[PDB]
């Protein structure tokens with residue numbers, strides 16, 4: 001998910 | 010540790026949001042968009058075919074995507090947010106970002122319009138209403154919320170803690186560690202209470218006012234998602250950004 005992608009920056 | 014929580018959250022707010030209340034009021038005190046003519050003039054400079062309402066829709070949703078990314082980095086800087094399981098972090102952001110977006114959006118709004126394009130444009134409230142439905146039905150409840158929210162005369166230090174309390178909400182559907190997130194909110198809320206006591210000694214009832222604002226925002230977002238689905242299903246050219254459709258999905 002993109003939100004996961006944002007939170008794993 | 011709670012002794013530095015208020016300063017830490019305020020610093021993270023100043024660090025991560027391109028626009029805040031101090032910056033907005035300076036500007037509001039910018040190309041004015043008030044008709045189809047000035048909209049086209051503004052777009053000639055601030056934008057690198059589709060119907061005018063679909064163009065504003067895209068500029069609006071592109072703004073939200075940027076705010077969602079800023080809110081994501083803000084939440085990362087809230088002490089204890091990163092310690093939560095990653096699925097809990099997604100849930101808090103999923104349900105929290107649009108409550109925070111409409112709360113912070115008040116900072117760039119007055120009774121006549123709102124700042125757009127990173128402070129470079131100002132679109133009038135009447136022009137948005139003059140649009141065709143359902144696009145003219147979107148911003149009216151946000152201006153009304155912003156008008157009563159702005160009357161509380163919060164500053165960026167108040168708003169930073171308010172947004173932190175919005176994100177760290179233990180009530181969201183599907184949360185795993187409810188008891189710990191609730192304790193995180195209790196600390197943020199307690200620091201907010203203390204801050205409102207010092208920063209707004211003239212209104213010893215400001216904190217219950219803000220509690221109601223959090224409830225008002227949850228209703229403002231649920232009604233807003235209904236409009237998102239109206240546009241997703243009945244507007245072909247109004248494509249949804251993948252990140253936003255992820256957020257609005259099952260919410």
Ligand SMILES: CCOCCc1cc(C(=O)O)c2c(C(CC)CC)nn(-c3ccc(F)cc3)c2n1
Pocket residue numbers: 062065066068069070072073123124125137140144145147148233236237240249253
């Ligand atoms: C400051 C920039 O953001 C403003 C605030 C804003 C936010 C959203 C949002 O849900 O992300 C949004 C939308 C969504 C569909 C309902 C896009 C997913 N549509 N509109 C909107 C469109 C046309 C208008 F004429 C006025 C508002 C919006 N506006």
